[PDB]
Amino acid sequence: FYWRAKSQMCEVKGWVPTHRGFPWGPELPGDLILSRRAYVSCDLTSCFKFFIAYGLSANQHLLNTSMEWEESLYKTPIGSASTLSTSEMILPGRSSSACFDGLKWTVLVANGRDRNSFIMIKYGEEVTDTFSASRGGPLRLPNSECICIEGSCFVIVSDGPNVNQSVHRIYELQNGTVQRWKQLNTTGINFEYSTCYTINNLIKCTGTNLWNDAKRPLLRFTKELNYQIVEPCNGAPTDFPRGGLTTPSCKMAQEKGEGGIQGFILDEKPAWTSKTKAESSQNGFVLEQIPNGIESEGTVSLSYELFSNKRTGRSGFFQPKGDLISGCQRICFWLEIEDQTVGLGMIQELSTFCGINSPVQNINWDS
Amino acid sequence: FYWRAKSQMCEVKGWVPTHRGFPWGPELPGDLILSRRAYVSCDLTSCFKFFIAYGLSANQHLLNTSMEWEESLYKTPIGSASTLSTSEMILPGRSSSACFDGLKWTVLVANGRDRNSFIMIKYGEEVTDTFSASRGGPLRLPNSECICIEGSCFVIVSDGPNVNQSVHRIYELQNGTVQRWKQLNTTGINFEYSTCYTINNLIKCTGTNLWNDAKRPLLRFTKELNYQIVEPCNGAPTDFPRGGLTTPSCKMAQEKGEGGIQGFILDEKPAWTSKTKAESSQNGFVLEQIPNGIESEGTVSLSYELFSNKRTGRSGFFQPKGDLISGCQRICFWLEIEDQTVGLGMIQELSTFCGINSPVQNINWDS
Amino acid sequence: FYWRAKSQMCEVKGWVPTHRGFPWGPELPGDLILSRRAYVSCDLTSCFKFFIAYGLSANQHLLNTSMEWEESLYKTPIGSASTLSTSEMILPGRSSSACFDGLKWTVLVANGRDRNSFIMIKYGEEVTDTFSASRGGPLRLPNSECICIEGSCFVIVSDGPNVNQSVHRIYELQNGTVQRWKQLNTTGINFEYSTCYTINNLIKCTGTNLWNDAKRPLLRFTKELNYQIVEPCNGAPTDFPRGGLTTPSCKMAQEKGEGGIQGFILDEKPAWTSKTKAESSQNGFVLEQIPNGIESEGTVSLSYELFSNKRTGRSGFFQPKGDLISGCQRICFWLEIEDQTVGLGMIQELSTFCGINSPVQNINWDS
Amino acid sequence: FYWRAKSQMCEVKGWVPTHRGFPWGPELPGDLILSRRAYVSCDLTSCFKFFIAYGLSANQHLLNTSMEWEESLYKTPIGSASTLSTSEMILPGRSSSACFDGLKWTVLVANGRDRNSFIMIKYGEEVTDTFSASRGGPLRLPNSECICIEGSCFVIVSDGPNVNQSVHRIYELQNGTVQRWKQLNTTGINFEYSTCYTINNLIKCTGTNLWNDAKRPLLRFTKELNYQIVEPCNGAPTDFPRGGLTTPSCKMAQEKGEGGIQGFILDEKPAWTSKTKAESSQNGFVLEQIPNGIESEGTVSLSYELFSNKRTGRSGFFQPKGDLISGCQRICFWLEIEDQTVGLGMIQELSTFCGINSPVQNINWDS
């Protein structure tokens, strides 16, 4: 009854778009709910976009409301645009995580500022738990799906006012109730915006180091909260911003390590990295396969420039949970595509891509 | 299969927002159904806003229709804005009550002026009972959820043309059919706008005395309709309008006792009172904990100022009906927040809060 | 598996509104589908408004389209306004009938002019049958629900170009396929706009004589298509137009017999008649109880004036099919309420009333 | 579980409209998704319009977006207008095919240009296969429903950069997974826009020759992918453009053979042809019955001018899948009708007609 990943991950030799973002810009229709910090998560039947709403479109501008500073989490079926008719308001929240365990949705949101920040957890209809900042706040949820295995759901929560002394904990939940937690030893790094997937009883997450690294730190942990934090050992940093290519080593890429943006590394053998085409602008998106894994020298084989010029933002994992034909576990990612509008600035729309077990041509989806 | 409350109510050390009203104001979208006399009630998976429609928005002003005087009850999933696409017209009615017994919805509405006033009851999609005013009318339902236990649903019905000569009955329904009713001895008082909850085969309601009390009368009764009406024994009335603090006693507070607004007191030990921040205006909302209970002298311990400057209105209880994890009974409340709009007056929107068994910081939800 | 009415009709002591029409007028929101020839019919769960669409509203005026002359049948859930989001286009058609037999919807529509007229029938998704005019056409369906008994559904179909030489057949269908039909002997009269119900596995229909009667002819028939056409033996015609009150006989009332409008008579004991408040215009609506039946002298006990001043139009029967509580078969009617608009003329909205076997007051629902 | 057509096709003596396209033009409502390359396909309860969206309506004009060049496949229930609330984005694609096998939808889309072109396949909610071009691309799906028999689904895929050297293959899928394919010998012809149906475990398709024929080539094949390609042997070409009548023979009609539009021939005995009324413009639509089959001399018996002056476009087969009642297999077709708008050019809307077993009169559906 509780979901768990299929026994092995599908071989990944390509990536195909299953959903392009709605093609808004320079104009968009009215009564659209404008979203940020969006991500994807699925029940056993279909997938949804979870997001924080910050405005509603009206004649190309923003309806004058308090939506921007009264922050609430919404969800919309992936195949629909986010409008008042198609989107459901779930809880108030500035950051969030959500995941379906096979029976019910567990949803976490963070509210309040600094020392007042607290997290609440909902399982189904029911608020089941809360906890407050303990290292100064704000508490921060990763804005990517949490990970459920056989009824236990895991999420990374971050605390602390400064990226140079952040605190990161794994929380284990059951029926929306904290069972235990483990504070990770992250001395010398920062680990925000965890995006994760699960395979053979392991949870693997990619972080974003906003302090002193342009490589993305990686976390591997078990259902028992045993863990290891790992550094990519190639010479191609994947955060944005970042410096240029370097000699492969397991060392941090400190050139332009400050700042960053949510992103992912498929931490398997082969591994896949993902990054902007250019180190100079947040444009394009490139997927590269590293057969010997992320802790090898990083020699690339397959390479796919999914976008060249389109402006791209945050990205992260989600996993289909109800496949019937596939005997192996599929892996997908979501990716913000940024569009310029005439009357309310830069918007982002999520597209989604899933791994396939066959190679395809190096199609450019810029269109 | 019929819902029943848990044997004892959860500890409440704090209140967190589960739904902040849709953030309309100064502008709001077109084709919104404007609501009044709203309250919240839930089935096993979702919560709904039940309300009387009084108009439709159109380009920031009111569409010219008969909606305000041809009154009908609607319901909207709490997480959706009320539009013609998301809201369902249930029955015509000037006042109402609704509750889910585990299988189907019981809905009661009152219609008619003075002596011709009558109440109609629906169970699922079927009209199942009616009854007429017995004391001159109009019949008034409380505009807060009715209370179901083991398939019996209970609601306070009021009658009589004046507040100084009002009559109030507990009606028990099963399958939308009146089983019995009991007329309360309310001589000397007035008991409008009952808002109730249940635990352990007890039902507790907070009333509003529109005649001669600025404290709120309380009612406790059993499934078998044995009851007592009791008066708060502190010195801080919680109706609006009201006078200032006085010496604690079990006596009514007649200073500014005339008039009032629907509100609630959590009648447990500890007890929780709720009220506007000051007697001078309908601004803010404050929750105060009284460890020794509402019939004690009223010494307060915990105190939360959930709102300071936002204008607030009606408030009442609701109980989520899908609680599968908690061993104890949770409690929540809904609350009108008033906002000014550019072109159709002051609107009301429901926010909801639920009690949690741990404290949180004294957050002000004004912004 | 197939629906049949409950063994006995509920006693009808009064009539209560279950749905007041949407209170549009003088203005209406945009994107409403404007409806005519509407009626109500139900599945085992809920009820739908079936109608021929003739336009779409846009800023108080009609969008400029072909909708008025390319006529199509739609349905909308009764609790929803008819919008592009809530309404479903079923089949093209200028008149129609629909009924749910417990498993699927049977829908009939007529198309074409005079000699070219044909009817098609849908059962579920599938078009199951069609037939052509036999008497010069146009074929005309009654714009009221057809009548299903244990998987056989019955509908009255009218043919013939002249009202003084009309032809009427009872058609019996199963699974949307015509099993048999029976031509009625209606020489001397005209029997359009049949509106029917069933009980004691009899079908009873009220007609509209557009030729030479201000009284309404009545039809009674069995599953074997044995039948009786009967005239009301009171002196109070219920059609419109109509002449003045007169002497109780079983004689037609030729006075202002030409023309007419769809209406109903509860052909039981007691019987109920229904008509505008008075003969001069189309205002109000009056329900009158005749204990001895419609073939008696026609003396009235109860007289409920449901509307006094509101302008009213077509009316007809519908039967709830999924009642779980009532052991007896309920009976309802739909009724056109006409409202004037600022920019697109007179519109019609359906109200629905249901009989109750409990008490009710003589409330007027005009204001 | 799996769908299969009956052993015999129902008798067609007539064609009646089951859906007249939404009657837009000269005006249309806002927030409508505009469609191209649309076709109809059904599951067990409902029929859907599948289409490639190219824009969104706003105040009579095209919203300024990237929708025309970022092409995605959408699906709308046939009885709803395509809006943001009623339409579902399925997959990115420039052409597509879809079909329901009794359990799930199989959906194919083609993306990329020339050598990068590839098709991807979804079965239910899961991507299940992909394949690439064999002759330089682009791969082209026929934009009409694929054909499922007993769980095996068949579709024609076309390849190659020039109509004078096109390649065409039958692909057989099961569970959205390619089982096998067969490249057809189409030397000397071109076979685009296949529109197909099934009867008695055969598949029949009508192609469009864009190279050198104004007659339409026909394909017939078995589940085992044994096939024959045939030429109509009458003297009346049905492609558009086309020349005039000729002496009947089995030879290609090369006058004005270049170019074409998707269309159908019912390849039975009797056979039915379909074409524009006018030879030199795309106006009207005429269905002609040829008793001795499409390989006969072509003598026409029944003839129906369904449209005279309406501008018409693509047309193709679909087969309703809920047909529980009939013992014979029904056949329908969809057809583009084009209308002029005030502010955004020609739009096309699909109408649908189904073959019925009874004759009807020669109705003109222009009005």
Ligand SMILES: *[C@@H]1O[C@H](CO[C@@H]2O[C@@H](C)[C@@H](O)[C@@H](O)[C@@H]2O)[C@@H](O[C@@H]2O[C@H](CO)[C@@H](O[C@@H]3O[C@H](CO)[C@@H](O)[C@H](O[C@H]4O[C@H](CO)[C@@H](O)[C@H](O)[C@@H]4O)[C@@H]3O)[C@H](O)[C@H]2NC(C)=O)[C@H](O[C@H]2O[C@@H](C)[C@@H](O)[C@@H](O)[C@@H]2O)[C@H]1NC(C)=O
């Ligand atoms: C691939 O298909 C080619 C085309 O076939 C045709 O189109 C395809 C789409 C299908 O519809 C087929 O059913 C069609 O046949 C094949 O090439 C054609 O082959 C036919 C013979 O089968 C040739 O027919 C000939 O026509 C010329 C006049 O243009 C005459 O020499 C003669 O016409 C006959 O007409 C009457 C019969 O109806 C007789 O009374 C008369 O005496 C005479 O026999 C020929 O039959 C046709 O010209 C070819 N078309 C083209 C474009 O090349 C091709 O099959 C054959 O190719 C031939 C050249 C020949 O060598 C055969 O041995 C090949 O098998 C196939 N390829 C394969 C492997 O099957």
Ligand SMILES: *[C@@H]1O[C@H](CO[C@@H]2O[C@@H](C)[C@@H](O)[C@@H](O)[C@@H]2O)[C@@H](O[C@@H]2O[C@H](CO)[C@@H](O[C@@H]3O[C@H](CO)[C@@H](O)[C@H](O)[C@@H]3O)[C@H](O)[C@H]2NC(C)=O)[C@H](O[C@H]2O[C@@H](C)[C@@H](O)[C@@H](O)[C@@H]2O)[C@H]1NC(C)=O
């Ligand atoms: C808390 O983690 C600290 C940092 O560890 C590194 O970063 C983490 C985010 C994670 O990725 C982890 O896996 C990774 O190692 C620990 O401090 C580090 O300890 C390692 C040894 O395990 C040191 O490695 C040494 O470096 C010298 C340099 O000359 C080499 O000779 C050789 O490589 C050697 O192994 C790291 O230098 C050190 N990093 C820092 C910033 O201090 C820390 O564990 C250890 O702390 C050090 C100072 C030492 O006293 C050990 O005995 C401690 O275990 C860890 N804290 C705990 C309690 O485990």
Ligand SMILES: *[C@@H]1O[C@H](CO[C@@H]2O[C@@H](C)[C@@H](O)[C@@H](O)[C@@H]2O)[C@@H](O[C@@H]2O[C@H](CO)[C@@H](O)[C@H](O)[C@H]2NC(C)=O)[C@H](O[C@H]2O[C@@H](C)[C@@H](O)[C@@H](O)[C@@H]2O)[C@H]1NC(C)=O
């Ligand atoms: C066909 O029906 C006519 C009229 O029937 C009357 O109105 C019907 C709508 C229905 O309500 C019937 O119940 C009514 O009787 C009928 O002709 C009528 O017959 C009655 C005698 O039974 C006369 O009183 C009445 O005046 C007469 N009306 C007219 C306009 O003719 C027919 O019944 C009889 O008609 C007479 C003229 C004879 O032809 C006789 O053989 C026949 O029974 C009826 N025709 C048939 C074939 O049954």
Ligand SMILES: *[C@@H]1O[C@H](CO[C@@H]2O[C@@H](C)[C@@H](O)[C@@H](O)[C@@H]2O)[C@@H](O[C@@H]2O[C@H](CO)[C@@H](O)[C@H](O)[C@H]2NC(C)=O)[C@H](O)[C@H]1NC(C)=O
């Ligand atoms: C009917 O009720 C009156 C009022 O009782 C009080 O107010 C009620 C709303 C409820 O809160 C009761 O519990 C209160 O006691 C009763 O009259 C009072 O009786 C009490 C003693 O029992 C006395 O102290 C008060 O002064 C009385 N007040 C008045 C106005 O006389 C009365 O006893 C009840 N009648 C019956 C039939 O029991």
Ligand SMILES: *[C@@H]1O[C@H](CO)[C@@H](O)[C@H](O)[C@H]1NC(C)=O
């Ligand atoms: C929104 O409206 C308010 C109220 O009039 C006004 O003060 C403010 O300038 C507006 N803000 C924006 C974002 O335009």
Ligand SMILES: *[C@@H]1O[C@H](CO)[C@@H](O)[C@H](O)[C@H]1NC(C)=O
């Ligand atoms: C970490 O960064 C913050 C913000 O720039 C700074 O104020 C703080 O002092 C830093 N910590 C130290 C001690 O370097």
Ligand SMILES: *[C@@H]1O[C@H](CO)[C@@H](O)[C@H](O)[C@H]1NC(C)=O
């Ligand atoms: C979670 O709740 C389910 C009831 O749905 C229960 O069976 C299970 O034991 C619970 N797990 C824990 C440890 O809370």
Ligand SMILES: *[C@@H]1O[C@H](CO)[C@@H](O)[C@H](O)[C@H]1NC(C)=O
């Ligand atoms: C609404 O329209 C009515 C009828 O035309 C008119 O009497 C009135 O002025 C309007 N009401 C308002 C408040 O504008």
Ligand SMILES: *[C@@H]1O[C@H](CO)[C@@H](O)[C@H](O)[C@H]1NC(C)=O
């Ligand atoms: C309501 O009615 C049903 C019969 O339809 C009966 O089985 C059930 O016990 C009743 N429920 C209650 C709460 O009385």
Ligand SMILES: *[C@@H]1O[C@H](CO)[C@@H](O)[C@H](O)[C@H]1NC(C)=O
């Ligand atoms: C609708 O538009 C048509 C075509 O432009 C035009 O002939 C007509 O004037 C319009 N109809 C009305 C009543 O506005």
Ligand SMILES: *[C@@H]1O[C@H](CO)[C@@H](O)[C@H](O)[C@H]1NC(C)=O
């Ligand atoms: C109607 O359909 C039902 C269900 O398939 C079937 O049992 C019955 O035989 C059908 N009746 C006729 C007369 O077609």
Ligand SMILES: *[C@@H]1O[C@H](CO)[C@@H](O)[C@H](O)[C@H]1NC(C)=O
């Ligand atoms: C095929 O068509 C192309 C495009 O028109 C043309 O350039 C080429 O010459 C043609 N080839 C032959 C052999 O007909």
Ligand SMILES: *[C@@H]1O[C@H](CO)[C@@H](O)[C@H](O)[C@H]1NC(C)=O
């Ligand atoms: C398609 O899936 C069904 C359900 O598992 C299965 O019965 C069938 O064998 C599958 N077909 C193939 C080609 O494996």
Ligand SMILES: [Ca+2]
């Ligand atoms: Ca960084």
Ligand SMILES: [Ca+2]
């Ligand atoms: Ca009982």
Ligand SMILES: [Ca+2]
């Ligand atoms: Ca008061």
